[PDB]
Amino acid sequence: MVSKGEELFTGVVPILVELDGDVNGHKFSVSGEGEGDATYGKLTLKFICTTGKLPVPWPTLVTTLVQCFSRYPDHMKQHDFFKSAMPEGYVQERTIFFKDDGNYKTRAEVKFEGDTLVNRIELKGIDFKEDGNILGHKLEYNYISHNVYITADKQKNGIKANFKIRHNIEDGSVQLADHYQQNTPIGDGPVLLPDNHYLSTQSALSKDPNEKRDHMVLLEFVTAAGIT
């Protein structure tokens, strides 16, 4: 491409996601494909477990499996770190702490390869309970949380974020998952370092009735907010 930063996102952009994971002695891989339309904050993706049965619940991987597709209101476009890092991209790292259970540690590189926005991820699970909500596959196949709270990390020329996800459990209880996130640019060039704000996400998890592989279909709408 000729284009840089926000100019890369003005139409519909193809997305490719590749994840390698290891949790509870089970190595697995996930591939995803779809498209993103940042003008409307809209993402449509289908994910497939390419190694057989996914050893963790699909809802626990949603946040790991491209915040560059967020709709930033015109008055907030100076605060969009994620697009400003493109096409060279950014590293996104998280620790996701499942309350009274284990943790995910994730590292991803998000960048353009030609026309396609690619998210390549490694995930490691730490100290999960075999009888717990995650390894028991006790989570409902839905989603209920929305906000990601962003702050600048100027010393690293990037951002941090923190937010709690609530996963509904089949018995009516909830499993909390506290996300700590850091993003840093891959390249040497400038980025937009934002004032405090948040991303609000609306979602929908579904299934493809013709797909025999373990999979997840995702529709998401994401909008930046919290400044005037």
Author numbering: 0 to 64, 68 to 230
Q: What does the report in the manuscript say about this coordinate set?
A:
The examples shown in the Methods section ascertain that SeU can be successfully and conveniently used as a practical and easily applicable vehicle for phasing novel crystal structures of macromolecules by the SAD (or MAD) approach through the anomalous signal of selenium. The use of SeU as a provider of anomalous signal for the SAD phasing has been examined on crystals of several proteins and a nucleic acid.
The two amide groups of SeU may serve as donors in hydrogen bonds formed with various acceptors, such as carbonyl or carboxyl functions of various amino acids, hydroxyl groups of Thr and Tyr residues or suitable atoms of nucleic acids. On the other hand, the Se atom in the central selenocarbonyl moiety of SeU may accept hydrogen bonds from various donors, provided by amides, hydroxyl groups and protonated amines. The high concentrations of urea are routinely used for denaturation of proteins, but no adverse effects were observed after relatively short exposure of protein crystals to SeU.
